Ligand binder design. Structure first.
Ligand SMILES: CC(=O)N[C@H]1[C@H]([C@H](O)[C@H](O)CO)O[C@@](OC[C@H]2O[C@@H](O)[C@H](O)[C@@H](O)[C@H]2O)(C(=O)O)C[C@@H]1O
Ligand SMILES: [Cl-]
Ligand SMILES: [Cl-]
Length: 227
């Protein structure tokens, strides 16, 4: 067991999408008759005129290796936040099935099971103060060593990079969506909020007695062990 998110919500979305592609194929939709290694869920734009961010089931063979403007794909952390992950949508040639309602409902279900109350609290602090941001302890602009608690705009995070987050005991944990400390415009898009985030984390009630030891887990609740 690593002290890290299992990315269980994302895993549930991809499985549900593999099921939907298999049903579509059975319905005659030939382009969806693929092995399950070819299907993932992404939160993204679709083809031309599909311009909002929706949960869709994509054939990875139709995804671009990288994105230009508004066409990147997003994956989801175990608190239900969407974060850039590798790939881009081909606006003419994408092979996908938009399934926003079922996939959103699985995200809400997963958030109840997996999202650390301590992380929920830190994310809420960030969102209230800077709409759209989530909390990580990670890199800032042009410095690839130093970490601090910051409210990060989700578009500036990288799902493939794990960064420190709060476990469900309020202890060190690592979650997808991190910074590299590089020097691009995206690397500027955060608000360092060391005191406010730490207080938000500290205000959460322990799931354990003041005499028990909280051992965190990648799904709620953590272990409470007698001292
Ligand atoms: C421009 C942007 O999106 N984020 C800035 C961020 C914000 O301007 C700030 O948090 C707004 O409240 O500031 C960052 O620098 C913090 C740093 O800023 C200096 O001006 C000051 O000298 C320092 O005391 C300190 O506040 C941040 O990390 O928060 C940079 C970020 O790019
Ligand atoms: Cl997570
Ligand atoms: Cl749906």
């Amino acid at each position: 067991h690593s002290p890290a998110s299992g990315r269980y919500i994302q895993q549930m979305l991809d499985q549900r999408c593999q099921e939907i592609a298999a049903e579509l194929c059975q319905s005659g939709l030939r382009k969806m008759c693929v092995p399950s290694s070819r299907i993932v869920a992404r939160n993204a734009v679709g083809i031309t005129h599909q311009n909002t961010l929706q949960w869709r089931c994509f054939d990875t063979a139709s995804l671009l290796e990288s994105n230009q403007e508004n066409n990147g794909v997003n994956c989801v952390d175990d608190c239900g936040h969407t974060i850039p992950c590798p790939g881009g949508v081909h606006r003419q040639n994408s092979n996908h099935a938009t399934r926003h309602e079922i996939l959103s409902k699985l995200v809400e279900e997963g958030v109840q099971r997996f999202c650390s109350p301590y992380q929920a609290s830190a994310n809420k602090y960030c969102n209230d103060k800077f709409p759209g941001t989530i909390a990580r302890r990670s890199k800032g602009f042009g410095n690839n060593v130093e970490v601090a608690w910051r409210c990060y705009e989700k578009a500036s995070l990288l799902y493939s990079v794990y960064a420190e987050c709060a476990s469900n005991c309020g202890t060190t944990w690592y979650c997808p969506g991190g910074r590299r400390g590089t020097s691009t415009e995206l690397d500027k898009r955060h608000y360092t909020e060391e005191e406010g985030i730490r207080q938000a984390i500290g205000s959460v009630d322990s799931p354990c007695s003041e005499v028990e030891v909280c051992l965190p887990k990648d799904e709620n609740p953590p272990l409470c062990l007698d001292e």
